[PDB]
């Protein structure tokens with residue numbers, strides 16, 4: 001029994017925030033939310049990666065001091081995530097003094113167990129990705145302007161040769177112990193094919209890792225290696241330590257950090273239950289990170305879910321090349337909950353998704369408006385629900401027991417998808433049941449039963465309300481604002497809107513009064529063809 005701990009990756013602050021970071025954090029936010037809906041202590045963590053050469057030089061380009069720059073951008077991030085209506089507990093910055101204490105404390109652990117030694121790194125490097133790459137992983141390409149140069153195959157960004165005396169981590173010694181972990185825990189990297197990638201890599205062989213860099217190279221914009229001011233710590237070790245730092249910070253209601261604890265157990269968050277990340281940063285989390293943690297004798301995480309990169313109208317995203325995709329703007333256009341749904345629904349973690357205003361409307365009209373929207377407006381109209389209450393149900397037909405089974409079985413299958421995690425599958429799961437409820441309703445024809453057979457209408461309405469309820473509960477994390485509006489319409493008491501107990505069918509007693517119906521309001525609004 002522990003605080004469920006879920007992360008988004010801390011984002012480089014070299015440019016403004018955009019869909020990549022928003023999507024990543026939404027997943028994190030959703031996973032966190034669901035576990036809270038369960039009624040569990042949760043700790044969600046997003047943040048910014050502010051040190052290193054990439055950011056140091058991005059500051060230099062705009063021609064302002066990095067101290068000013070990083071605080072400026074971090075602000076654009078805090079603003080945007082605040083606009084997206086997330087429920088992240090704390091927002092972490094690698095410039096934070098408590099974080100340094102941790103980073104240094106972690107360093108010394110690695111040093112005291114003798115897994116750090118002074119060496120050299122002579123090889124390729126991407127500043128834009130802050131990644132060490134072998135000659136096999138680089139190719140010919142084009143300079144930021146004219147000239148021929150070498151680029152990364154992974155990312156297409158320029159690589160420079162580096163020949164520095166660095167401090168070296170014995171990553172090569174943790175190959176065998178990594179492969180046991182990949183096996184021992186064969187659902188610890190999601191999705192499965194990304195797990196096969198990681199194993200295949202570690203199987204080939206692992207070099208040692210440069211965990212320090214010549215102070216000059218970095219423009220002194222990093223964390224000093226303990227005992228040697230000539231060096232600074234690899235921006236990635238710095239960043240990967242964010243998870244441990246955040247696990248150790250007591251946090252006030254205003255959201256400001258108020259204290260760094262000595263030991264990770266004191267807050268019961270570490271090790272992270274889930275690390276949400278993107279495909280592009282897999283090796284750091286799936287190879288380096290566990291190797292570090294093993295070295296330092298800390299526990300390893302439970303799950304790492306890597307996702308893909310987005311597009312718009314089948315063309316990659318770029319502010320400069322004619323195809324932008326501003327989430328705060330599209331959220332203001334179509335609705336914040338609606339946009340989150342689309343992003344979570346349209347593409348699963350094994351896929352590089354495709355937004356378009358066409359499909360956004362298709363799914364908004366088809367699913368949000370027509371499936372779910374009509375269902376809540378039906379079972380709560382004056383027309384069908386003449387007493388504005390939860391009716392007491394008569395005897396159940398087999399076709400009733402049929403639907404009830406779905407509704408009963410739904411929580412458990414959604415629990416699994418949410419836990420994998422596979423948020424797409426979980427949404428579909430729910431909607432299958434919503435579709436099933438709209439069939440049952442069309443078939444029972446309650447509009448007609450209000451005059452023919454009120455004793456029967458009681459059993460239909462009840463099942464429909466309880467269906468809509470349980471489905472809405474399990475969509476809570478996806479549609480946080482709209483689920484509340486739904487629950488209000490239904491008149492579901494606040495105690496019943498959360499908690500594992502209210503997954504069970506029949507948790508709201510009959511006689512429960514519905515919410516006051518406002519005439520002007522709809523739940524979802526259709527858009528043009």
Ligand code: MET
Nearest residue numbers: 009010011012049239240
């Ligand atoms: C601690 S995970 C770091 C992620 C990295 N800063 C990025 O934005 O890709």
